[PDB]
Assembly symmetry: D2
Homo-oligomer: 116 residues x 4
């Protein structure tokens, strides 16, 4: 699994479940073409977005719909979304976990990049 | 000063100086119009981007050029940039500090919103 | 597994491997009695610290030896360690993951608390 | 002002006001001696804890009473407190800002260290 997204909730101390996640790849004309999407599981994880053949070098964007998550919990959020943009596979294919820790007025994001 | 951006370096425990910051506002036709730009000072802060009169209700995007900051230190970081997108002033005028704390493979961002 | 500790490295974008972790429980005379210890695995995780019978209600401390980790990488750290202190099981037993995301001059820590 | 502590609330996007902070210094016999204390102001900042002359080289501990902050807002948070332990001034006098960004089940902390 070359790309996994994990989302955590810092208010409740839990996985952030049912969070919508959309992934894009930058096109040659600098626009964002859709690539994959899903919703986080009960563990806060979204697996199966891509395959190693399809996940070529490129610039990728992961947009996490944080606003809808907080609205569903009845909590006022600051951000419209949380976006993570990164160049992938520049030194060979890697396994990427993009993690985000959400609070209503703040988020943290990190990448765990491992070599299979 | 209705909008201030502050950037910190979590590796050195310092302000992140000379970081380029570009601010955009969403126009009525859903495109991103350039709104203001600048670079962080020796304190890691960027003041003077806008005025109370100009900073009307809207959806704003703050793009922080984190990649160039790390590259100038010899580091190839994970993220292309850090973007913060938020609705401003929808309950009346507020003062916003948008802060980002940078590491090569992670960042955190928070908003401090006050009512003068 | 009632208690797991996970440690990530925000500089390298990786699990933080071989990090020493010590766990204590607060004694009746308000001193910290040793409870368990280990080192993080190649996945940054430390499992098997306790059992559900032994992990009774109480105040627990997890001390993560961040300074030794950064020294082993040749990077100057700020903190002596990262400590997490929390009351456990106050509403019944839970499964706790204590996670820490490390940078040389900053860390983040969160708890993911789930009900089996 | 050689030591300043700043506390922010990631739920409301605000300073964390009236947070108690206690500072200790490690004595030659390895015990923690009380050094200074105070509470955060309306800006979330606590100034005036020490002076350049008194703030000698040593190992310092800053304990932030995060639990009482959340409890006064009706919340039972995960952590009992947030502690930050660090060696100060070992390369000569520096100015330290110790910041903490609080959520009910998570916190981040960073140090900004400057040379006047
Ligand atoms: O990114 C993080 C993370 C972010 C922070 O701000 C603070 C922190 F302690 C961890 C993370 C990544 C993972 O892969 C993961 O499993 C977990 N977890 O389970 O708790 C967390
Ligand atoms: O956003 C933060 C911040 C982010 C984190 O991950 C952890 C933390 F403790 C603070 C911040 C904001 C500010 O306005 C500010 O002055 C400072 N500071 O000087 O240190 C920091």
């Amino acid at each position: 699994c070359p790309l996994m997204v994990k989302v955590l909730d810092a208010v409740r101390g839990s996985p952030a479940i049912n969070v919508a996640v959309h992934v894009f790849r930058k096109a040659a004309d600098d626009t964002w073409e859709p690539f994959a999407s899903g919703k986080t599981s009960e563990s806060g994880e979204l697996h199966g977005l891509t395959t190693e053949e399809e996940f070529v070098e490129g610039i990728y964007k992961v947009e996490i719909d944080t606003k809808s998550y907080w609205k569903a919990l009845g909590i006022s959020p600051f951000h419209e979304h949380a976006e993570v943009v990164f160049t992938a596979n520049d030194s060979g294919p890697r396994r990427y976990t993009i993690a985000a820790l959400l609070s209503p007025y703040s988020y943290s994001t990190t990448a765990v990049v491992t070599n299979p």
